[PDB]
Amino acid sequence: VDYKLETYLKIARLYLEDDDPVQAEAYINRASLLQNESIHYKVCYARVLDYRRKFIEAAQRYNELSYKTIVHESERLEALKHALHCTILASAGQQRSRMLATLFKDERCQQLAAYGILEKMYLDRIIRGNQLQEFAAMLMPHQKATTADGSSILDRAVIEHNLLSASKLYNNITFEELGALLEIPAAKAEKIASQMITEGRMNGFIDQIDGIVHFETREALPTWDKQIQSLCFQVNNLLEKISQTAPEWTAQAMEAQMAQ
Amino acid sequence: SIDEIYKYDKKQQQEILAAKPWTKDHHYFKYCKISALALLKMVMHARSGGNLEVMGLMLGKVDGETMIIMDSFALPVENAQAAAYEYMAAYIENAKQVGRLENAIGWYHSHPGYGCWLSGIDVSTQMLNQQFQEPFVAVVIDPTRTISAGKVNLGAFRTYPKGYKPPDEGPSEYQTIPLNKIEDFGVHCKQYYALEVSYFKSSLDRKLLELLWNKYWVNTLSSSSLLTNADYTTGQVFDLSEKLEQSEAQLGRGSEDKLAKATRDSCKTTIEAIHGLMSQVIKDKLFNQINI
Amino acid sequence: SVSVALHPLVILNISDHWIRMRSQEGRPVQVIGALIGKQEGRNIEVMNSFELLSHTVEEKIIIDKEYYYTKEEQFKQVFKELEFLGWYTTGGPPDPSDIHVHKQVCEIIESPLFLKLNPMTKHTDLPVSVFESVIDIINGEATMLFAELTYTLATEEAERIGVDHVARMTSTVA
Numbered sequence: 214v215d216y217k218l219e220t221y222l223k224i225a226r227l228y229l230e231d232d233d234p235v236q237a238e239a240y241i242n243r244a245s246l247l248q249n250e251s252i253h254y255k256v257c258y259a260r261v262l263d264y265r266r267k268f269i270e271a272a273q274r275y276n277e278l279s280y281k282t283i284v285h286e287s288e289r290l291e292a293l294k295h296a297l298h299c300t301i302l303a304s305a306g307q308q309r310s311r312m313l314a315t316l317f318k319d320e321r322c323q324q325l326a327a328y329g330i331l332e333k334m335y336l337d338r339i340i341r342g343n344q345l346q347e348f349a350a351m352l353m354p355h356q357k358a359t360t361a362d363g364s365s366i367l368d369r370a371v372i373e374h375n376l377l378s379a380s381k382l383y384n385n386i387t388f389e390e391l392g393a394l395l396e397i398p399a400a401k402a403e404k405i406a407s408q409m410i411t412e413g414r415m416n417g418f419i420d421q422i423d424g425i426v427h428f429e430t431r432e433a434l435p436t437w438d439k440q441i442q443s444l445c446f447q448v449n450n451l452l453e454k455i456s457q458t459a460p461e462w463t464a465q466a467m468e469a470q471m472a473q
Numbered sequence: 474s475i476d477e478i479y480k481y482d483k484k485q486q487q488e489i490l491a492a493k494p495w496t497k498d499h500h501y502f503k504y505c506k507i508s509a510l511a512l513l514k515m516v517m518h519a520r521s522g523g524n525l526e527v528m529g530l531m532l533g534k535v536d537g538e539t540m541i542i543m544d545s546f547a548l549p550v551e552n553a554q555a556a557a558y559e560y561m562a563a564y565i566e567n568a569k570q571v572g573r574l575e576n577a578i579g580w581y582h583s584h585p586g587y588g589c590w591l592s593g594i595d596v597s598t599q600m601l602n603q604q605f606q607e608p609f610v611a612v613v614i615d616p617t618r619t620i621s622a623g624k625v626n627l628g629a630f631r632t633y634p635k636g637y638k639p640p641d642e643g644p645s646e647y648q649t650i651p652l653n654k655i656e657d658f659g660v661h662c663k664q665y666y667a668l669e670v671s672y673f674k675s676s677l678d679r680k681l682l683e684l685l686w687n688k689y690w691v692n693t694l695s696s697s698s699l700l701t702n703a704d705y706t707t708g709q710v711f712d713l714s715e716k717l718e719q720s721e722a723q724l725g726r727g728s729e730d731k732l733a734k735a736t737r738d739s740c741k742t743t744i745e746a747i748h749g750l751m752s753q754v755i756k757d758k759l760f761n762q763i764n765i
Numbered sequence: 766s767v768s769v770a771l772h773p774l775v776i777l778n779i780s781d782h783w784i785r786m787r788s789q790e791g792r793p794v795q796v797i798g799a800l801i802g803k804q805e806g807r808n809i810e811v812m813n814s815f816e817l818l819s820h821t822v823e824e825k826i827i828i829d830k831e832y833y834y835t836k837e838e839q840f841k842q843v844f845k846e847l848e849f850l851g852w853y854t855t856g857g858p859p860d861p862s863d864i865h866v867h868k869q870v871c872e873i874i875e876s877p878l879f880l881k882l883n884p885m886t887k888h889t890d891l892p893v894s895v896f897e898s899v900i901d902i903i904n905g906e907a908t909m910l911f912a913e914l915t916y917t918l919a920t921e922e923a924e925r926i927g928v929d930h931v932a933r934m935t936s937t938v939a
């Protein structure tokens with residue numbers, strides 16, 4: 214009945230702990246046929262997907278298993294931790310953005326050590342060196358996927374995120390300051406910025422003689438219109454707050470008096 | 474009971490259709506009434522179309538000498554028959570089970586930047602439609618002149634039958650038609666007549682619009698229309714220069730008095746520009762001149 | 766937390782739907798529909814809205830999914846760039862029926878919005894209220910609640926002209 218399934222799960226978990234994932238995935242796929250005839254199966258599948266450099270699926274599985282009420286609170290928090298870790302270093306895309314939004318909307322995410330990086334990725338902020346250092350410290354070795362020549366995927370993705378987020382604070386920036394803010398050599402900063410602009414990820418242009426990369430222009434008349442709109446929004450909100458925090462009194466009496 | 478226009482009775486519509494009075498007279502329908510929602514739907518669809526032409530259908534009913542339009546929907550048109558009629562039938566079938574009981578009463582399409590009139594193809598299409606399915610009406614919208622003039626440019630026309638020659642009686646307000654569409658406007662101008670257009674809305678719509686104006690004035694106060702339409706004015710100036718060239722050629726020798734028409738077009742464009750400037754002058758006086 | 770922009774066309778659609786159903790059936794009746802629009806980054810913008818077909822069994826509302834997918838293909842034929850965003854209804858404060866219908870809707874899109882209009886109101890503010898669903902754990906049970914979002918009004922020139930023309934309804938400098 215379930216003895217064979219339990220033995221298969223035990224063998225798969227032992228092979229996974231032995232860093233032999235091929236046989237574990239094969240055994241999990243074989244046992245999935247008999248699984249439906251009847252909790253730990255989902256955990257094993259999520260672990261297998263995590264071990265195959267497929268991070269968005271593992272994150273989704275871990276999040277959907279974090280809501281199981283038949284599981285202890287600590288294990289639910291651990292599953293949330295795994296989902297967050299797989300989401301942060303998952304490949305960039307729309308599904309990753311939806312996953313980040315779902316995790317940000319979760320209150321239980323506020324008691325984890327990787328929540329700050331989740332907030333910085335979702336809200337388009339600059340991730341400094343120390344935060345990434347601690348994140349790499351808390352990562353398990355199979356997560357750190359690096360090419361043979363180097364160029365760690367996580368570090369490159371963090372550099373791209375930092376440069377995109379710095380595109381929203383600066384009107385223009387030199388190469389030296391961009392390399393000091395990304396903590397990379399200025400030549401590498403110029404190369405990364407040029408590559409990013411070429412593929413259409415960003416809007417901007419590079420003046421090499423001046424050594425300046427210029428982001429969006431923010432022209433004058435549309436800026437004037439936007440500032441006018443914001444000022445009128447302030448007026449409307451102030452009136453709403455005055456009227457809803459202190460009725461009768463000034464609000465309605467002066468409204469009527471102005472009408473009269 | 475302003476909402477009574479929204480109540481639909483099928484028996485009266487069947488009786489009117491079976492006792493068609495429009496088959497005897499020809500200048501029968503002279504009033505068009507459009508709901509606020511339908512008009513807004515057409516305007517948004519035409520604006521979303523861009524600089525191209527978009528066409529859709531128009532559901533509604535009839536009431537005496539009045540054509541009432543209640544809703545609309547957009548045909549795909551990426552097509553006359555085939556795809557367009559498949560979409561029409563499927564949409565009507567889908568919408569009949571959610572509360573939309575009315576059937577088609579017309580078709581609408583946009584004329585971006587060259588007025589509201591029926592070309593030769595539009596006249597032929599309207600003749601074909603009125604031959605088989607009656608009553609019918611053709612609504613033409615200019616989504617670009619609406620922004621420039623601050624006025625909704627819309628016109629509901631109905632086409633005279635072939636072989637009928639009405640005796641004059643055409644007011645024919647002046648329309649600034651571009652040079653390449655003047656000839657098309659001339660041959661087919663007496664084959665159709667325009668219906669006077671009015672608009673209506675319900676009570677909840679009125680209340681919602683009144684409550685919406687309390688926060689919608691911000692967008693009016695921060696419009697800056699001088700930048701939203703900068704290519705339209707350039708095209709208008711090009712057409713006006715060509716018309717001036719033709720009027721000069723007419724002057725060198727020796728429409729009627731083409732100089733007057735060119736002057737009218739120049740005046741319209743210039744007045745639109747000055748209106749756009751004075752709006753910004755008012756904004757500058759209000760907001761920037763409070764220098765503390 | 767997303768930032769939502771609203772178009773007056775959606776409010777007109779909802780009000781017209783309510784008026785039509787109330788006039789046809791003879792008594793005021795709650796309506797249920799859908800919203801479409803475009804999301805850029807974290808900013809949502811609700812453009813249009815189409816009615817939806819639903820049934821009532823026992824005391825619960827069941828959304829007809831086949832009709833929804835038919836209408837989804839129909840609107841995708843025309844508005845290619847527009848995407849499903851959430852649903853709308855008419856009423857007052859959120860109720861457990863809205864929770865049940867939102868649970869039903871969540872099977873279609875991961876994070877739908879919830880728009881509620883109040884057709885019978887006494888205050889001097891727009892009765893449109895926008896909510897998002899947030900999952901929570903209470904006494905070891907997984908429930909969901911509504912968190913309200915602050916919405917604005919989208920700026921479109923043709924939309925502004927049309928709404929102004931509708932609101933007023935009757936020289937050149939003058």
Ligand SMILES: CC(C)n1nc(C(F)F)cc1C(=O)Nc1ccc([C@H]2[C@@H](O)CCCc3cncn32)c(-c2ccccc2)c1
Binds near residue numbers: 592
């Ligand atoms: C009601 C519609 C579907 N219809 N029914 C029947 C009839 F055969 F039954 C026939 C028809 C029908 O497609 N008419 C028509 C004719 C011409 C155009 C375009 C055509 O010239 C090329 C563009 C220039 C133009 C300026 N003004 C009309 N056009 C359109 C049309 C309008 C807007 C978007 C796409 C097409 C429709």
Ligand SMILES: [Zn+2]
Binds near residue numbers: 584591595
């Ligand atoms: Zn036409």
